[PDB]
């Protein structure tokens, strides 16, 4: 616990630990949702992880993401030493500077690229699920959730699959550190990996995502090698952690809810709507901003340099945004969330993520329509910048499946 700063009033101190929150055994989303009980203010300070503000309601989260002149992305991670070392592009830049790098990043993960990968995405999903289907069981996080999105990303980036354990280890240290590595060490290891590859693909340009970034232009002038490395590293982290973790929350839910499986089996055209409602309920990202100056925000004096967590996860769990927010309703009329962020840093990979989610749901429910959590298993979650599921043992009767 870190000393309460002079300017923070005692009545706003809620000691939430974003990397190990108290109620984690109830589920990670439920654990973060304690910040939205009736007694907790819209905006609290925690003395954990070096001390920082935490906006607890959607209205505040949205407002702060919109207002980049006060809430800068120059230092977006907690703790402060991670935020300070964080220099990925475009996330560590504010508009106007940030904008030129988004266009280039859209070339490698945008909707036209998803469209092109659509065949290989469908093929991999079907191939992984068919391999599992006759077994009547799997360790879902390791047997599908990791390989499906990771192999697609490695394909797109033109990187060998033998590199996956190394890269996955590093990305995990940046979002859910286990203590062995600081954020800055993990980041420099990722850069060290990328540097020779970026140099090779600048000499010998190809079709892969690293070539496209490394040989690209930003508003009409050549990207530097340094800029290319800082963008490629961001893309790697996005590719190796987000969808991986979200698939496991979604499948855990479906494994526990037969009526929700039945709804999608009966009406598969609802799968896109169900993806969105699962993105609200099992939102999993929480990063933030740093104050560029002293600023009074919703009755609370913030000091220049203060860090504020603006949990993208919380907005759609907010009762004030969505009635009965812990209930999953595929017919929910207005699904309101900030799962893919908000403002000028809106997720660039969201079209790829939705596609992978939708393809997974359709292809899993076609072949393995009925499945359950393995008898006796208690599923454990983990919290951090991106929250996750430690393991997800599933079982089914093969007699109920169908090869397609
Ligand atoms: C379930 C899947 C995903 C979720 C929930 C998610 C969430 C987010 C969020 C909340 C942000 C904004 C962060 C901020 O404002 O500081 C973001 C940005 C970003 N994401 Fe995603 N993401 C997902 C998948 C992906 C994938 C697969 C990629 C592929 C590389 C990706 C690439 C990016 C990039 C490049 C940005 C930065 C945009 C900018 O700073 O201008 N994301 N993501
Ligand atoms: C918070 C994010 C999900 C977003 C894309 C990858 C991630 C970990 C970042 O550093 C920016
Ligand atoms: K920084
Ligand atoms: Xe990518
Ligand atoms: Xe990349
Ligand atoms: Xe899923
Ligand atoms: Xe389905």
């Amino acid at each position: 616990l870190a000393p309460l700063p002079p300017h923070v009033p005692e009545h706003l101190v809620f000691d939430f630990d974003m990397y190990n929150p108290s109620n984690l055994s109830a589920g990670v989303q439920e654990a973060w949702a304690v910040l939205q009980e009736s007694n907790v203010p819209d905006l609290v300070w925690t003395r954990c992880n070096g001390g920082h503000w935490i906006a607890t309601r959607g209205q505040l989260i949205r407002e702060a993401y919109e207002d980049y002149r006060h809430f800068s992305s120059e230092c977006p991670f907690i703790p402060r030493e991670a935020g300070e070392a964080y220099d990925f592009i475009p996330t560590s830049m504010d508009p106007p500077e940030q904008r030129q790098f988004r266009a280039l990043a859209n070339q490698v993960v945008g909707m036209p690229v998803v469209d092109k990968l659509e065949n290989r995405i469908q093929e991999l999903a079907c191939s992984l699920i068919e391999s599992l289907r006759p077994q009547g069981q799997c360790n879902f996080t390791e047997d599908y959730a990791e390989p499906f999105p990771i192999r697609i990303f490695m394909l797109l980036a033109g990187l060998p699959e033998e590199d996956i354990p190394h890269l996955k280890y590093l990305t995990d240290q940046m979002t859910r550190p286990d203590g062995s590595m600081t954020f800055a060490e993990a980041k420099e290891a990722l850069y060290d990996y990328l540097i020779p590859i970026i140099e090779q693909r600048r000499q010998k340009p190809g079709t892969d995502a690293i070539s496209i970034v490394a040989n690209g232009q930003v508003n009409g002038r050549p990207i530097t090698s340094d800029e290319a490395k800082r963008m490629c590293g961001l893309l790697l982290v996005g590719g190796l952690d987000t969808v991986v973790n979200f698939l496991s929350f979604s499948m855990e839910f479906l494994a526990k809810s037969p009526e929700h499986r039945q709804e999608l089996i009966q009406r598969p055209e609802r799968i896109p709507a169900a993806c969105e409602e699962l993105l609200r309920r099992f939102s999993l990202v929480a990063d933030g901003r740093i104050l560029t100056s002293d600023y009074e925000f919703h009755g609370v004096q913030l000091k220049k340099g203060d860090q504020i967590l603006l949990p993208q996860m919380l907005s759609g769990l907010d009762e004030r945004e969505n009635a009965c927010p812990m209930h999953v309703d595929f017919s929910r009329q207005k699904v309101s969330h900030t799962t893919f962020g908000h403002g000028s840093h809106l997720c660039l990979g969201q079209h790829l993520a939705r596609r992978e989610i939708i393809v997974t749901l359709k292809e899993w429910l076609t072949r393995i329509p009925d499945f359950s959590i393995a008898p006796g298993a208690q599923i454990q979650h983990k919290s951090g910048i991106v929250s996750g599921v430690q393991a997800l043992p599933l079982v089914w009767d093969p007699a109920t499946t169908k090869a397609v």
Side-chain angles (χ1 to χ4, degrees):
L1 280 284
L4 195 71
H7 71 273
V8 181
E10 274 148 51
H11 78 284
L12 294 183
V13 182
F14 200 91
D15 304 308
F16 187 82
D17 185 359
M18 69 173 280
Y19 294 103
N20 197 214
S22 285
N23 304 11
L24 185 63
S25 58
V28 63
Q29 284 82 13
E30 291 87 349
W32 283 71
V34 305
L35 295 161
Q36 296 181 324
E37 283 159 6
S38 37
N39 61 290
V40 184
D42 285 9
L43 175 51
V44 296
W45 179 270
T46 183
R47 297 177 299 178
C48 307
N49 300 295
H52 60 257
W53 296 105
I54 302 175
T56 63
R57 296 282 173 186
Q59 186 52 42
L60 275 79
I61 291 158
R62 288 172 190 270
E63 272 181 35
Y65 279 124
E66 282 153 9
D67 185 6
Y68 54 83
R69 270 183 227 75
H70 293 174
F71 294 105
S72 176
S73 70
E74 205 189 300
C75 191
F77 277 24
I78 281 140
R80 181 179 293 284
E81 60 259 29
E84 272 182 24
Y86 189 108
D87 65 350
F88 288 141
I89 286 168
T91 306
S92 76
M93 303 177 149
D94 297 309
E97 192 187 34
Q98 169 229 21
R99 293 229 167 84
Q100 66 199 138
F101 297 96
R102 276 180 76 80
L104 179 56
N106 244 334
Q107 266 181 71
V108 287
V109 299
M111 189 58 166
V113 173
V114 178
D115 284 350
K116 238 169 29 183
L117 289 176
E118 167 73 303
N119 268 326
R120 292 294 298 263
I121 289 169
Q122 170 78 14
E123 192 279 321
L124 180 59
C126 296
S127 162
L128 293 171
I129 297 164
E130 179 55 35
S131 277
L132 297 171
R133 178 192 59 76
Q135 286 165 212
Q137 66 179 267
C138 72
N139 303 308
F140 184 81
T141 67
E142 126 162 30
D143 292 345
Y144 189 92
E146 287 163 18
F148 171 60
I150 297 174
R151 291 188 205 164
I152 291 297
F153 170 81
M154 298 298 281
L155 183 69
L156 174 55
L159 297 174
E161 290 182 8
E162 290 92 327
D163 291 353
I164 285 168
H166 182 65
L167 297 172
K168 180 57 172 163
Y169 175 76
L170 299 181
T171 59
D172 282 357
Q173 295 331 295
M174 297 188 251
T175 55
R176 289 175 308 286
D178 63 18
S180 49
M181 241 180 208
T182 65
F183 172 92
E185 275 154 5
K187 191 191 70 153
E188 283 306 323
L190 206 229
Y191 287 167
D192 187 54
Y193 178 83
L194 287 174
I195 283 147
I197 299 159
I198 281 168
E199 181 59 18
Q200 202 278 327
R201 292 180 195 186
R202 283 167 68 96
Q203 292 305 323
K204 233 178 137 224
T207 44
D208 64 280
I210 294 167
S211 294
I212 299 305
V213 168
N215 291 287
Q217 287 174 93
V218 291
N219 288 11
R221 58 104 184 161
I223 196 165
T224 64
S225 300
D226 168 68
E227 286 165 340
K229 165 202 86 185
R230 296 159 59 192
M231 166 158 6
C232 284
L234 179 58
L235 289 171
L236 264 141
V237 175
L240 270 49
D241 206 35
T242 59
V243 179
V244 169
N245 293 294
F246 178 80
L247 289 173
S248 289
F249 294 116
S250 291
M251 280 298 288
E252 171 188 7
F253 173 74
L254 289 176
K256 291 174 162 180
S257 189
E259 283 186 11
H260 289 83
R261 303 194 299 267
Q262 172 186 166
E263 187 170 348
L264 300 186
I265 288 154
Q266 289 180 332
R267 302 221 164 186
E269 76 274 6
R270 286 191 187 176
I271 278 169
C275 164
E276 214 59 31
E277 167 69 349
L278 291 164
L279 282 162
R280 181 195 67 74
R281 180 56 179 81
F282 302 105
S283 201
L284 74 170
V285 176
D287 78 345
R289 296 295 183 261
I290 194 177
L291 275 286
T292 56
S293 67
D294 293 350
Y295 177 45
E296 199 191 310
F297 190 62
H298 288 258
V300 194
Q301 254 269 225
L302 316 180
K303 182 166 95 56
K304 187 173 178 297
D306 280 0
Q307 287 191 294
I308 178 158
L309 194 70
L310 297 174
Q312 285 94 346
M313 194 229 2
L314 251 22
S315 308
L317 297 178
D318 189 351
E319 255 183 17
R320 303 176 199 167
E321 265 193 22
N322 297 285
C324 299
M326 300 309 263
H327 172 230
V328 169
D329 185 3
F330 296 160
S331 297
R332 192 179 278 286
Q333 267 118 240
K334 276 136 74 206
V335 184
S336 168
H337 66 49
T338 53
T339 293
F340 288 121
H342 189 91
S344 82
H345 291 291
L346 274 171
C347 179
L348 284 166
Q350 64 178 276
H351 313 319
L352 179 63
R354 283 199 180 87
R355 184 59 61 74
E356 292 171 343
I357 295 162
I358 290 163
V359 166
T360 292
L361 291 161
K362 179 78 197 342
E363 300 309 330
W364 191 283
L365 292 166
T366 301
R367 289 172 180 77
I368 312 167
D370 186 69
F371 53 98
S372 300
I373 309 278
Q378 230 71 192
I379 310 312
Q380 313 230 190
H381 296 163
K382 30 179 191 188
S383 192
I385 300 281
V386 180
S387 297
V389 182
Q390 227 310 271
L392 182 55
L394 302 177
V395 295
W396 56 94
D397 183 357
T400 66
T401 64
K402 81 191 185 279
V404 167

